[PDB]
Design a protein around this ligand. Structure first.
Ligand code: HEM
Ligand code: HEM
Ligand code: HEM
Ligand code: HEM
Lengths: 141, 146, 141, 146
């Protein structure tokens, strides 16, 4: 459960990301693929070479979905309902992988927001992606 | 793996009483029922909509015996699981795209099945030795992933 | 989320457990300490030897909170609030351990209730133990 | 720890630029703020109720340096982590009673701190080398648990 303070922190930090979202989503993906290679089994149809257009396109989508969740932080389960059915019923990606991508999103954010990635903020962002992950995984069984 | 002799021998004696056909069928099926997302890899097996259907599916049963058949052969190689399962890891990674986390899950289901079948004989010490074999097997199956 | 069939399966299984609840809780604890020795770090104050009285007593406590939760299966959060508080603010056991004990409770049930541990019932119980766990870790941060 | 030589040089090269005293304190601080349950081990450290209380606590800073000093020392022995950390492993198990998952948590927070400090210089390839390193340190610290 997010606290008022968490929502404030997430809005602030995500606010400074701004129009870098897509770019930061693609980098998270690249980070994940290199640090945790078992995550690649979920993308066999993709070309995963550095600078790949599929990876870039996928980053934007992921980033847009996270921008939506921030715009709907008091109603995330309904705002992400659709994405949640998709993962549970079509994609069927193991849950363990959501933590790995969450970790990588934080690393990317930390790499790009020196001034905003304070401790309290890191704590809030980590609680946020943990909640996003929980919703997207809620209907797996 | 780091298996004590009393451990090595608890594993071996129990496995001698296992009906690999029934046990592999029951393990793979329970995997598909208890963790439904594992059904992605088996779409072409048929109807997997209900537990009953899963459990009565012949392709699931035959697939279970093949899997447990290979597990069985690896128990004669506990000092070299990595070398024994090397080409199997490569295939699971490169041709089949199976997340290793699935191996871990199959392993724990397998431990539930052995318990179900053997009751009292599946004691806490016997179980601890099977958890080590099961993780060791999963680890070896994931070893060549890149 | 537990479906009605789940609640029905859990209720049936646990009902057969009957007066063996405490004995099975102690058994699961014992299988957990041996199978997953890192879990012993949470009990440096207990005598952990076979058949010791602290494990027995503790098994019953756990087993009773589980009976309570099956009886309040539609209202878990409320029924387990105090235990949820206790785990998050005092004991502070690492969330990762809940999965390990859960698994050992399933192995203990499979072992004692063969006719009742069908695949659908295994599924339901795994889901219930997972929800109990979620509830007991929901206030950690 | 299976590390390529280019992985080993990228790790070492960056570590060359780290101020361990300060990074030691940042990482231990953030662990306690982000994963507040980990505070159950430092109740004698006084006030840990808000982030500045934690991050500014002198005992937290002094302990952070102590923790990262030993990590650092392990970076000079990447081929023998297990041996290098064996007495620390025993200690954390038998005296301190620290669950090993805590070593993984710290590992991940350290990677974020390195990325916070170094920015773009902490490239995807460099992070991946650091991930292998922090996992090996965590495994080595856990290895004598029993
Ligand atoms: C923060 C967590 C995540 C979010 C917000 C997210 C969001 C999305 C979105 C918006 C899509 C696009 C679906 C469409 O076309 O409308 C998608 C697809 C997909 N995601 Fe998830 N995703 C997340 C995590 C994951 C992770 C952990 C995995 C597994 C590693 C994953 C694997 C996939 C795959 C394989 C697709 C389909 C890609 C394709 O074939 O084009 N996602 N995700
Ligand atoms: C003890 C762990 C496991 C072992 C020893 C094992 C072993 C095997 C073997 C021997 C084959 C036959 C390959 C061939 O015909 O050359 C196979 C095929 C396969 N396994 Fe595994 N397996 C394990 C776990 C898993 C699990 C957990 C999954 C996914 C849930 C999985 C998915 C597959 C798939 C998709 C195939 C191909 C089936 C087909 O040809 O249609 N395996 N496995
Ligand atoms: C199935 C999930 C669990 C349930 C329902 C549960 C329930 C309980 C109950 C009823 C108590 C006694 C509280 C009291 O005296 O008022 C307790 C305490 C405790 N639990 Fe949890 N527990 C669970 C999982 C775990 C986890 C996995 C661990 C860590 C390995 C754990 C560690 C402890 C510890 C150390 C105590 C205090 C023991 C003492 O000093 O007597 N519990 N739990
Ligand atoms: C990189 C991993 C770590 C290393 C290399 C490390 C190393 C050390 C060292 C050198 C000491 C002092 C030894 C002594 O007092 O005799 C120490 C003490 C301690 N460590 Fe670890 N540590 C690590 C991670 C952790 C973390 C994750 C925790 C807990 C969440 C922890 C808890 C403690 C505690 C409680 C002490 C004793 C503090 C006191 O004096 O009151 N350590 N550690």
């Amino acid at each position: 459960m997010l606290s008022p303070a968490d929502k404030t922190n997430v809005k602030a930090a995500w606010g400074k990301v701004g129009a870098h979202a897509g770019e930061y989503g693609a980098e998270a993906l690249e980070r994940m693929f290199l640090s945790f290679p078992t995550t690649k089994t979920a993308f066999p149809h993709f070309d995963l070479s550095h600078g790949s257009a599929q990876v870039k396109g996928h980053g934007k989508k992921v980033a847009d979905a996270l921008t939506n969740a921030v715009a709907h932080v008091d109603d995330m389960p309904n705002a992400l309902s659709a994405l949640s059915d998709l993962h549970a019923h079509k994609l069927r990606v193991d849950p363990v992988n959501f933590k790995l991508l969450s970790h990588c999103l934080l690393v990317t954010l930390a790499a790009h927001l020196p001034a905003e990635f304070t401790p309290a903020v890191h704590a809030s962002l980590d609680k946020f992606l943990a909640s996003v992950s929980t919703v997207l995984t809620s209907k797996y069984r | 793996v780091h298996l004590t002799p009393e451990e090595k021998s608890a594993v071996t004696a129990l496995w001698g009483k296992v009906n690999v056909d029934e046990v592999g069928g029951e393990a793979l099926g329970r995997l598909l029922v208890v963790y439904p997302w594992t059904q992605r890899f088996f779409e072409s097996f048929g109807d997997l909509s209900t537990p009953d259907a899963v459990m009565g599916n012949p392709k699931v049963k035959a697939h279970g015996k093949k899997v447990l058949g290979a597990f069985s052969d690896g128990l004669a190689h506990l000092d070299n699981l990595k070398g024994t399962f090397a080409t199997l890891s490569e295939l699971h990674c490169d041709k089949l795209h199976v997340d290793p986390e699935n191996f871990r899950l199959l392993g724990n289901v397998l431990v539930c099945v052995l318990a179900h079948h053997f009751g009292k004989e599946f004691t806490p010490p016997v179980q601890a030795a099977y958890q080590k074999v099961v993780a060791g097997v999963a680890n070896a199956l994931a070893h060549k992933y890149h």
